[PDB]
């Protein structure tokens, strides 16, 4: 009686939300960007080849200087790379051999990795002793940590395999804010350029917008039909794109609260593990499990380029802030840069 | 020749880091990686006691062999995400308690505690990631199994089981049920064993099983097979 009443009330609310979403739809992205000229066939080539890892690579993040990048692998070490000279700056031996995410501080002094141990370790790159040391370990989670992105030097948002996200304070090592709106494993999070909001993707085939200050959920998206494993904000912050195992990519805006465009091909059966945008948002790069990479025009939903440098599942993809370089990681222990 | 003084030393630092990573990889290549798996109340402590955070690791050495076990029994989430992180292990150490034939799960349902292990055993065996990785099955609580079947018939879990109600006869039927779940008989082989309580056989059975899989795998990369 009461359960059915609450369920029908929730269903009425969902129907009202769906009607508000559908009624506020004049046209699609294809009709608006119909007269836009195509980007053309994009051809990239390997400019740099990094071969320092001995195991599968799961994560790779760029720094704010466009020259340093961090990469995480199953061998148990974090390596800082020099993109212009193919040199290693620091070697960080990890305590846990299983790591699935890595981050780089915006100032460039801290690097945090996650893993299956439910612990986020803060490493200080700039020390007065010439050695990377552990700053603070965050163990207030009950699931595997899948993503971590630094809001600033003292505050970092870390999403884990549990339905609860968190905001941490490195100086105190406490969980200041908890996000308990998801019903599945959260795979990736993407911070906004203003460092005030972030969209998280979960395995429940749904994405939710969050706030760093209030800790409440604002919008919910349900376009995907499978577990969303990758997420990335548009450079303006107006929108974001996700990627699931349904061999389909979709673009969800924050102002319209509806699916703008869809990215799918008939010959694509594999899933999506990484998604990133160009400096201007005109080109989209996604990580496929077909041992290759693809480039998609965001405005026209057309394939622009196909990268086939790696020989294994392409786990990660990153773009420099300048746009002057694009790196791509994979389970094959070889890192490459395209431009 | 076209590098400065500070760059030529960074190159040497990078070469030293590469030399260290190579020796670390060569040292980690002489170690055996075993995935420790088990359903609820599967008596895992049996082997862990003899050998002596979400994922727990245990490192022991036996006969100049560095074994590393990684228990994943404390990870309560979607297995599909973290199951591929263990691709390439030597073998899996699965545990099934024999006293589960007449017990029900925490949720009162028609599902039996013995069939619950069969569902997890069939899943890990048919996983796309685990195709040639062998399984070391340790049947725990062999003593309580004999006493309970004397008081209650085995027809509770296996009604079609028609035979003599004894220890050897009933345990043999349970072993066949788990071994018949392996669809790919050619690629992977199951190694069933009974957990000796007082004896130290368990650590010896793993030694015989790991050395056997390595021999079966070394010939696969030499042209004999």
């Amino acid at each position, epitope marked *: 009686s009461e359960l059915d009443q609450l369920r029908q009330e929730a269903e009425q609310l969902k129907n009202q939300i769906r009607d508000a979403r559908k009624a506020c739809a004049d046209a699609t992205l294809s009709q608006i960007t119909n007269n836009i000229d195509p980007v053309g066939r994009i051809q990239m080539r390997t400019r740099r080849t990094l071969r320092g890892h001995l195991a599968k690579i799961y994560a790779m993040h760029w720094g704010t200087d466009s020259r340093l990048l961090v990469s995480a692998s199953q061998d148990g070490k974090l390596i800082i790379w020099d993109s212009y000279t193919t040199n290693k700056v*620091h070697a960080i031996p990890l305590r846990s051999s299983w790591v699935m995410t890595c981050a780089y501080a915006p100032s460039g002094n801290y690097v945090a990795c996650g893993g299956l141990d439910n612990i986020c370790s803060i490493y200080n790159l700039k020390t007065r002793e010439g050695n990377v040391r552990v700053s603070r370990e965050l163990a207030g989670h009950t699931g595997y940590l899948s993503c971590c992105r630094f809001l600033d030097d003292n505050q970092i948002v870390t999403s884990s395999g549990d339905t609860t996200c968190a905001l941490w304070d490195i100086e105190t090592g406490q969980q200041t804010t908890t996000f308990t709106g998801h019903t599945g494993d959260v795979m990736s999070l993407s911070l906004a350029p203003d460092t005030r909001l972030f969209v998280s993707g979960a395995c429940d085939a749904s994405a939710k917008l969050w706030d760093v200050r209030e800790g409440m959920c604002r919008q919910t998206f349900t376009g995907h039909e499978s577990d969303i494993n990758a997420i990335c904000f548009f450079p303006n912050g107006n929108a974001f794109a996700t990627g699931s195992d349904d061999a389909t990519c979709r673009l969800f805006d924050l102002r319209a609260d509806q699916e703008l465009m869809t990215y799918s091909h008939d010959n694509i059966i594999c899933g999506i593990t990484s998604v990133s945008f160009s400096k201007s948002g005109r080109l989209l790069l996604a990580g496929y499990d077909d041992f290759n990479c693809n480039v998609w025009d965001a405005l026209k939903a057309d394939r622009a380029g196909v990268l086939a440098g790696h020989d294994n599942r392409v786990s990660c993809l990153g773009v420099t802030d300048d746009g002057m370089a694009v790196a791509t990681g994979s389970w094959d222990s070889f890192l490459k840069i395209w431009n | 020749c076209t590098l400065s003084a*500070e760059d030529k*030393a960074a190159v040497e630092r990078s070469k*030293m880091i590469d030399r260290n990573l190579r020796e670390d990889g060569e040292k980690a290549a002489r170690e055996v990686k075993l995935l420790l798996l088990g359903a609820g109340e599967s008596g895992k402590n049996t082997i862990v006691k003899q050998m002596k955070t979400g994922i727990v690791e245990t490192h022991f050495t036996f006969k100049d062999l560095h074994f590393k076990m990684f228990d994943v029994g404390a990870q309560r989430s979607e297995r599909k995400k973290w199951i591929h992180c263990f691709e390439g292990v030597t073998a899996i150490i699965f545990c099934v308690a024999l006293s589960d034939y007449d017990l029900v799960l925490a949720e009162d349902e028609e599902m039996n505690r013995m069939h619950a292990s069969m569902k997890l055993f069939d899943s890990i065996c048919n996983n796309k990631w685990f195709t040639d990785t062998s399984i070391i099955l340790f049947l725990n609580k062999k003593d309580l199994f004999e006493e309970k079947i004397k008081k209650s018939p085995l027809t509770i879990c296996y009604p079609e089981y028609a035979g003599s109600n004894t220890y050897e006869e009933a345990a043999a039927y349970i072993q066949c049920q788990f071994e018949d779940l392996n669809k790919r008989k050619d690629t992977k082989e199951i190694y069933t064993h009974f957990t000796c309580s007082t004896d130290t056989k368990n650590v010896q059975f793993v030694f015989d099983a790991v050395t056997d899989v390595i021999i079966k795998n070394n010939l696969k990369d030499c042209g004999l097979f």
Partner: single-chain antibody, 231 residues
Framework: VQLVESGGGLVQPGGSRKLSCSASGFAFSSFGMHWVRQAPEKGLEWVAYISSGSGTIYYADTVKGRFTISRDDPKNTLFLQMTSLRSEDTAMYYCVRSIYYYGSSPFDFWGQGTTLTVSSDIVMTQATSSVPVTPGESVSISCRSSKSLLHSNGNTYLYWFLQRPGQSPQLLIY???NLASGVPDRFSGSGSGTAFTLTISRLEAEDVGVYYC?????????FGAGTKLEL
């Protein structure tokens, strides 16, 4: 980080003596070691250098063939063997640590020093020797070189050091445009081509001593005459 040096004293000419340094508080293996000595009157000159891993050993032209530098990684001790000492071997040797990577600051620490008394190179020259600026006014210290220190990578390998009276040298600005750790924002300088300048603002009583310069484009590292500010 503390570097203690000992083993120096009075030695007759024609003999031999060894210097040792005690490193602690940091990774001695990851930091390269330098040797710099100061004449009793004025002047700095690089004497030896070894890279991380007991390789890339360099010596000075004056002491070529007579000095031997070695480092012990397990005990974190630096060694320097001297043979056939002459009348020129009268200078206080300061042990320096350095590490080289992107964003690193070489010559970031200088030991107290050990006294020693015996009974195509880039040349840095500056005519200015003393500056009468009173406390509270800005100062300017200019230096010149024999050729452009800029490299194809874009970095100008210029270094500035300050040796306060009765104190060890300290790194103020490295790479020409970057500031070291623990240095206030008062010390700053920027120079292109072959002419450089150091513009100190809000001069304090502690900011006194001799200001030196060094180039690291090529070896041998050569210092300059330097300007000694007065208070």
């Amino acid at each position: 980080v503390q570097l203690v040096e000992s083993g120096g004293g009075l030695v007759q000419p024609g003999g031999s003596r060894k210097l040792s340094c005690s490193a602690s508080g940091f990774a001695f293996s990851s930091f390269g070691m330098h040797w710099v000595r100061q004449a009793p009157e004025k002047g700095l000159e690089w004497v030896a250098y070894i890279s991380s891993g007991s390789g890339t050993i360099y010596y000075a032209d004056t002491v070529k063939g007579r000095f031997t530098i070695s480092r012990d990684d397990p005990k974190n001790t630096l060694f320097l063997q001297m043979t056939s000492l002459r009348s020129e071997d009268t200078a206080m040797y300061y042990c320096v640590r350095s590490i080289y990577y992107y964003g690193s600051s070489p010559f970031d620490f200088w030991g107290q020093g050990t006294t020693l008394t015996v009974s195509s190179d880039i040349v840095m020259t500056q005519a200015t020797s003393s500056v009468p600026v009173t406390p509270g006014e800005s100062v300017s210290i200019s230096c010149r070189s024999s050729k452009s220190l800029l490299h194809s990578n874009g970095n100008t390998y210029l270094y500035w050091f300050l040796q306060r009276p009765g104190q060890s040298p300290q790194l103020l600005i490295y790479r020409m445009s970057n500031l070291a750790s623990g240095v206030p924002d008062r010390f700053s300088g920027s120079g292109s081509g072959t002419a450089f300048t150091l513009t100190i603002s809000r001069l304090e009583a502690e900011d006194v001593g001799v200001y030196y310069c060094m180039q690291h484009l090529e070896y041998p590292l050569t210092f300059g005459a330097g300007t000694k500010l007065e208070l």
